[PDB]
Design a protein around this ligand. Structure first.
Ligand SMILES: Nc1nc2c(ncn2[C@@H]2O[C@H](COP(=O)(O)O)[C@@H](O)[C@H]2O)c(=O)[nH]1
Lengths: 90, 440
């Protein structure tokens, strides 16, 4: 069986008005072989701003996290940046 | 409150480190407990009710793979003395940068070693991911290490096999740089639980592990005692403020709100801060984290704070916030750092200008000059002005950032003194900043 890692990505909006539902739908629409989207929650980071924290399981040899982060960040209308909140081997 | 420490668990794919780490989190923490509960109940089907923790761990893994579990990848567990934030090191190649510039650097590394003859040898290969991880930890100053020889059941808890493994592993880690005498070697069974939390009854010859510390010799029997014996590291609370920005928001009726992790010092409302490399100075109106407003943000806190007369446009990700009246952060003309070249399909010559990731900065920096090549472990200068670097070399290099950049010497501000060098879809080197030519 293939090596996997479970990753929790933080996806940040532009402001407190950003449509977070559209933002997460855009992330989940991203399809790649070896990529499995998991649970997500909108977490407050202060001053009314909420970030998207979403889990995903990736096959190490098939899914580039650098590329994945870059792809999410293409949704400029909703995403300011992305960061890895945490990652573990499975 | 229990003190906080970070631990990274490394080892070869067949070492069984995931089951090992999972067992600790399962019995000493509370991660995805509702999933655990479901499987503990289901296990009644196996017989009349009895179940192995390793079975439950197996089912949790598959559940996580389906993407239906609820908890995030930030895992923690407790010991008598600590709340441990643990990372079962991913094999993923992108984890290398994350290990270098990510938050939560390790206070101790736990190397899990498979005891089987074939698996043991495969694990200490000179080109293995496990050695790279060990090297990275050592290079980043993770001086505390614990070794657990797993799968002792597969070699029938044989004392001689354990001793030979300790011998060869000591050689392995010594070449990396760790002094084996300070490393506890714990024979365990991650699957059967031997010496995990309770002492084993399968090895009469086992007297326990031991390690030399500065105060004396510490001994124990289990992996948990080994972890609990990790030495308390000193935190940056006392050093000047340093808060790398991750994001900057423009919130109506409030203004500019940068967000970032407090790496050193403390941020409080009322302080007057400066943002480097821009050089903008202002007062901190308020600070917030999650739902609560704070009286202070301490090292480790990812906080958002509000400042006035600062268009979001004048400060950005990568900039560093600090105290304007206590060694304020500054940009630099250049910085000299010890670079360790990792295994990669290439060779480095002066002029090389790859992207460098340092705290939240992502900037291409020129390897302006190859000042010296050094013995990696001792730091002794082997030659002046080497003409190129190849995998394995440790060297002092003069860097010139292509964009305004704020960095620190690793000795003074660790989180802003270590960096990852990216190229060929991988981290090709790791640097530790030794001096900075600041900007005035
Ligand atoms: N014999 C034996 N195998 C183990 C032990 N702990 C883990 N393993 C096995 O080692 C392999 C995996 O490690 P993991 O996949 O959990 O990192 C699996 O095949 C797992 O069942 C142990 O104490 N004894």
């Amino acid at each position: 069986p293939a090596a996997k890692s479970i990753v929790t990505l933080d996806v940040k909006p532009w402001d407190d008005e950003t449509n977070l539902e559209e933002m997460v739908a855009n992330v989940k629409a991203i399809e790649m072989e070896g990529l499995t989207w998991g649970a997500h929650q909108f977490i407050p980071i202060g001053f009314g701003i909420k970030k998207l924290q979403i889990n995903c399981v990736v096959e190490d040899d098939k899914v580039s996290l650098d590329d994945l982060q870059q792809s999410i960040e293409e949704d400029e209308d909703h995403v300011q940046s992305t960061d890895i909140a945490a990652m573990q081997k499975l | 409150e229990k003190s906080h420490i970070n631990v990274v668990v490394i080892g070869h794919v067949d070492s069984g480190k995931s089951t090992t780490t999972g067992h600790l989190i399962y019995k000493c923490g509370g991660i995805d407990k509702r999933t655990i509960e479901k499987f503990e109940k289901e296990a009644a089907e196996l017989g009349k009710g009895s179940f192995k923790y390793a079975w439950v761990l197996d089912k949790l893994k598959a559940e996580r793979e389906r993407g239906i579990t609820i908890d995030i990848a930030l895992w923690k567990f407790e010991t008598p003395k600590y709340q441990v934030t643990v990372i079962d090191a991913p094999g993923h190649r992108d984890f290398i940068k994350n290990m270098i510039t990510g938050t939560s650097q390790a206070d101790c590394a736990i190397l899990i070693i498979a005891g089987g003859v074939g698996e043991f040898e495969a694990g200490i290969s000179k080109d293995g991911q496990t050695r790279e991880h060990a090297l990275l930890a050592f290079t980043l100053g993770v001086r505390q290490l614990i070794v657990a020889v797993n799968k002792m059941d597969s070699v029938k808890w044989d004392e001689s096999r354990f001793q030979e493994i300790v011998k060869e592993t000591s050689n392995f880690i010594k070449k990396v740089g760790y002094n084996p005498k300070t490393v506890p070697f714990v024979p365990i069974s991650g699957w059967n639980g031997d010496n995990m939390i309770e002492a084993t009854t399968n090895a009469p010859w086992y007297k326990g592990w031991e390690k030399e510390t500065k105060a004396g010799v510490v001994k124990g029997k289990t992996l948990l005692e080994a972890i609990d014996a990790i030495e308390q590291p000193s935190r940056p609370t006392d050093k000047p403020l340093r808060l790398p920005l991750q994001d900057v928001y423009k919130i109506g009726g409030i203004g500019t709100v940068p967000v970032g992790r407090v790496e050193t010092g403390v941020i409080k409302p009322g302080m007057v801060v400066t943002f480097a490399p821009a050089g903008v100075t202002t007062e901190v109106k308020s600070v917030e984290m999650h739902h609560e407003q704070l009286e202070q943000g301490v090292p480790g806190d990812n906080v958002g704070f509000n400042v006035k007369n600062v268009s979001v446009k004048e400060i950005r990700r990568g900039n560093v916030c600090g105290d304007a009246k206590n060694d304020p952060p500054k940009g630099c003309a250049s910085f000299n750092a010890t670079v360790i070249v990792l295994n990669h399909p290439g060779q480095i010559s002066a002029g090389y200008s790859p992207v460098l990731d340092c705290h939240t900065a992502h900037i291409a920096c020129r390897f302006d000059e190859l000042l010296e090549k050094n013995d990696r472990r001792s730091g002794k200068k082997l030659e002046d002005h080497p003409k190129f670097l190849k995998s394995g070399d440790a060297a002092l290099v003069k860097f010139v950032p292509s964009k305004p950049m704020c960095v620190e010497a690793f000795s003074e501000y660790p989180p802003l003194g270590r960096f990852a060098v990216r190229d060929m879809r991988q981290t090709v080197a790791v640097g530790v900043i030794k001096s900075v030519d600041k900007t005035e």
